[PDB]
Amino acid sequence: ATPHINAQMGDFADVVLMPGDPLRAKYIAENFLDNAVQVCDVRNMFGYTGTYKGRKISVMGHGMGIPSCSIYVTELIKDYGVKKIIRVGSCGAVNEGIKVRDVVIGMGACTDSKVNRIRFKDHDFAAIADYKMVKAAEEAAKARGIDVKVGNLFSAELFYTPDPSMFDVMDKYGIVGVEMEAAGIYGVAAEYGAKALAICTVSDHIKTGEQTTSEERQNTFNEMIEIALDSVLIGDQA
Amino acid sequence: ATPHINAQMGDFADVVLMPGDPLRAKYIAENFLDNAVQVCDVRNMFGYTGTYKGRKISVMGHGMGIPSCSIYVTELIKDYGVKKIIRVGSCGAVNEGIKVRDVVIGMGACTDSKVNRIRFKDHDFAAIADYKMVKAAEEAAKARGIDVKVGNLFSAELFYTPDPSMFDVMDKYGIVGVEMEAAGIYGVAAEYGAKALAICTVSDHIKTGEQTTSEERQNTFNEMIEIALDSVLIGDQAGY
Amino acid sequence: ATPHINAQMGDFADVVLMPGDPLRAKYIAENFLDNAVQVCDVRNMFGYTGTYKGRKISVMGHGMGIPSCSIYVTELIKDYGVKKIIRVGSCGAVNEGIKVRDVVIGMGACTDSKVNRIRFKDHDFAAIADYKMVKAAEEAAKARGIDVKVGNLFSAELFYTPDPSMFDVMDKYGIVGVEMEAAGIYGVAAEYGAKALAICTVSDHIKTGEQTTSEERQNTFNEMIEIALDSVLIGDQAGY
Amino acid sequence: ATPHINAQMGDFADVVLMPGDPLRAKYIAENFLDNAVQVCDVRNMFGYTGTYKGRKISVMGHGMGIPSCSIYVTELIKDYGVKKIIRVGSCGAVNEGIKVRDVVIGMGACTDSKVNRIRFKDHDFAAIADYKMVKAAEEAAKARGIDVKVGNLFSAELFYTPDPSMFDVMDKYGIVGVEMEAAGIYGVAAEYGAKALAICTVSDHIKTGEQTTSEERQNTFNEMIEIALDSVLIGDQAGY
């Protein structure tokens, strides 16, 4: 066991879906997997393993923000043999053409965190997803007739930002959604030589102020989950 | 409600103890407070309000790392009228003379986060506790005969750091414990005009490799909790 | 006319292939395009427009390094209506699994340049290609039976670097090739609302020392050219 | 013996009061210590040793600015065996409720200098005073009925700042005074394993433009001296 995960090697599948909300992981396990079993619950950070169409798949919360998800992702990779991480998150939109409930896929993630500069000799690391995982997710979406935008996320350090003018800069630069984790997840994946992807559902609009309820974020973002799960199967086939 | 707390204004006391672990907050509420009631549970981040020797006090988890605790601390101050935050955390020691289960108090907190540079025009903001809160914590510890070191914490971004040589730099500079939150909490406190303090129990020795179990971290760090709660009463005194 | 391009609006197609070397552009126009006409030659930076399998396409050199290519790409987009840029470059390999003449596609581009920090309030801009352009290139490669790797490039400021230890960091982080341009091109595309992709042919192995000749770089990297041109046709398909 | 101090080991007490102004050091020695003797004068930077209530105490100027004071503080600690440094300085107020002649105590010191980034791998070092020294000064002030604010100083590089908008930022973040030294002194004390504290008298109001005369700064800031001296005796107590 680790300080953060009360599980043993083998308890996780080699692919893990990760929302920041452990109650969304519970929702995913109970409603999309067969034979689901809870495998960890330290700090209430619930993780589960079950099967989807014959395929062993895990789902586990990562908490909010880069330093939180970095602990969980690093442990899964280095202690539990995990090969692929798919973050299944929420995000706030800054572009007028991107609506609440749209699904976006972060091929890259910008950030105002220092973590990748710490890794990368204070130069610019382009925090990117694994291409084949991006392609598999886009393809899974198309097959279900779900529209997705593939582009840059922005992984924010401060949800309550003292610099809101930066949202306009994000919009100008084509950022598809604001969250707080992907750039960190992609940094860990590169560091440890694993593969990662972040898929998010727009849960609020930073410009219009439109919101979803805590309950909707927890229980109703089903399209991203279907896309994520199908993309796992597509990945196995190639 | 806010996106992260399903409570109403008035539901929290004006002072809140905050461990990173919502199960530690549950433990504190159930074992140290009278009249305890759970006031929130979004994302499993449990928060409670009760009384300690008659004084209304809340306790709530803040999650791990600066971006997480910044969310919760900001909301408590700006949305729930909270005046004082006492982080009751764990930490790793870098100094050979600081032992697992030692209690330390962060008058200041160093960090490798960018959050305070973002706030402070890319200059060095010294992330500090409120002085009277520090003094009250130290004097609560003295009364109970619990030894404490008061000094600099280091709030790390990366628990699994790619730069372990930094630990010896921290030690050379007198850092008393490594955690992942205080510098962010002190930044929010200054930005929003409130007061904060971080008190931590050493749960790991970073030099030797010693690590307490998950369960120990959750339910057995009683000294810091006693100090924290007594410090609230001390700090309430007229003219303290 | 601009200071760097003596051409008229309309003289370029809405897609432009850009090698660093204006003589590689000449090679491409003369050997891969039909009815090519030279449209510019300021500073010996040759550009041409012709057709490929009926589709109007331009090819123009961008010189070496981020500041050079930034000028040409910016002008093409803002002054010449160009919508899509495909850099067709060379690069150095840092991974021993990657060989001279391998073709790599930069879905992202790391850099030690300050240009994106200048644009992006000193934060980390993830300099990325347009996804549909990456997909079209990878599919064009497959249709030709050409192996490719899709990953991070590193756009270097100093070819003669004072810090060769950085190559090992690049390799550890999975950089598929070192060049000097993509991160700048991707920054311009995003700043000006256009689309870009960099495909490169490995021309040097930085670990082993293998180095192709100038003539080889100029006239013999055909596979990347084939992939770029084919990818334009794929990218044109309605609904792609 | 050192390039900046023409004294011998033993000439300084283990506690040194340090104003920036060597003439304020002379004022202090002549008016607050008994039997003070001058022990150094290189570069006109006067230092003295005498007794206060029989207790050996030194006072010596440190010049203006982080690089100047760092030289002197470093030498005192590493070459003259000094254990505690109490800066007795002036400062400019940025908060309207803070007045000329108010005494402030720097539990922390923010800065726009690069010196601590140089020491601390380019991370944020929270430049803090020694806690017991803060507490002793605070308590000495209360015993004399002198109000003091305990909080963050801001140690500035440029007295004539090109960025006066930063003063508004300091005020919003609760900075109690602007001086030019504490963050550097605190950085030295941590690097060399000693203890330090900065106590300052407000000599300038940065918002209103009020400025005391050079005469006043040199010979009339008596309260901070009384507090500093009393705090030495308080801090000497075995179990303090």
Added chain:
Amino acid sequence: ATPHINAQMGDFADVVLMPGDPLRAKYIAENFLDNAVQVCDVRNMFGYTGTYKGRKISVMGHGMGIPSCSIYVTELIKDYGVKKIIRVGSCGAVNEGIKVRDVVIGMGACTDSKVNRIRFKDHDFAAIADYKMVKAAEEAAKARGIDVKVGNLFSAELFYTPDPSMFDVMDKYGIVGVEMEAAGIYGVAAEYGAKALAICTVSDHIKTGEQTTSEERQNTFNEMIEIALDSVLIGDQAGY
């Protein structure tokens, strides 16, 4: 041969004039040198060697921007035995009193590039010319009755800058011209132990918007060439 220069040792003189434009190099070689022969042409980057009043002199393009010119200048110095580089460039004026066709000499060059930080442990390297080269050029100009301003250039990374407000900062600080190369050439010269100088003719006024044609930049900036060539002879003198 190198990947950028198809010449051998001995093909270049020990002093090389370098415009960014290889066609300006051709112009110089054809009209100001005797018996100029073309010694390289890779990537269309023309270089020539002839004589001026019997003295062996080379002229070669360096392309646009710091990363491009760094390649060529580094190769000339380390692979071709070159001792002195004289950039003969264009530049944009930011001062009202500096006019198109004025000749300026960069004793130093500011920059927004990261290259010298990369070289100089992230500190500030003052990118400066060789003093005697500055003196020879200034004296050559005076002997010709040509007025020159000697001061700081600014070597820009982005010609199409997203921060035009920086031009006013340059003007306030006395920058005599903005180009894109000098700070990088000066860093290479210092890194490799050679000597360099940048002399530039104002081709654009950034404040007034006035411009010259590409043809003018290429074929008509004669005063800087005459000054540069005269300065080589002056600088050759024993005891200069």
Added chain:
Amino acid sequence: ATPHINAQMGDFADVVLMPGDPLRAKYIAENFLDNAVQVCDVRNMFGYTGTYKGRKISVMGHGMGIPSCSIYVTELIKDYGVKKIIRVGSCGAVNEGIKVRDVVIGMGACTDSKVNRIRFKDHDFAAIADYKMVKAAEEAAKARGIDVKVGNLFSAELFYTPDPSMFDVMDKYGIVGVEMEAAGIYGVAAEYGAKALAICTVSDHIKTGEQTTSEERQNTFNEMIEIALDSVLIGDQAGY
């Protein structure tokens, strides 16, 4: 009067020589100027005005380090009408061919200070001397048969540096002397539109350990004083 200078407009000449050490300023005034009178003495920072060969000249200490000298030089320029500042300092050598007592001239000054980044939007300001002042000083030296090196100083923040490996980088980049002021003085001069120069006598060798005494630094660096004063008269010449 200012808080740092107890003099009135007119008390200073329009050129001021400035050592860091106010006792060296006294020495210069008493032994090199005619009819010198002391014009200021706040914080023991002695300043004087007299004549050299009939020319009105001032000499005043600036203290140690960039923040200290920035105060005095800024006041001299903006409050006392000063046009030219000649720092007459000491420095440490890092190159094995530069010896104690050699005289060097800082045409540029590198620095690890943040001051010019603060001024210059976080870019690289090349902190340079005024060209005619450098030329006049070099030519004054030659006329006295005094050999001088003209190049980059390094203005250090931390005399007791925690990074002595930086000295090798300085040597590799051709730094002629290490002091603690020039880069600051040059930035002030540029900010306020005045002119400055730093001439320094090597007072110790950072590589070999060789030193000079406090008394030698104060009273025996005559060559640099003679050069500085002579350079004033040369610089006054019409048309120089």
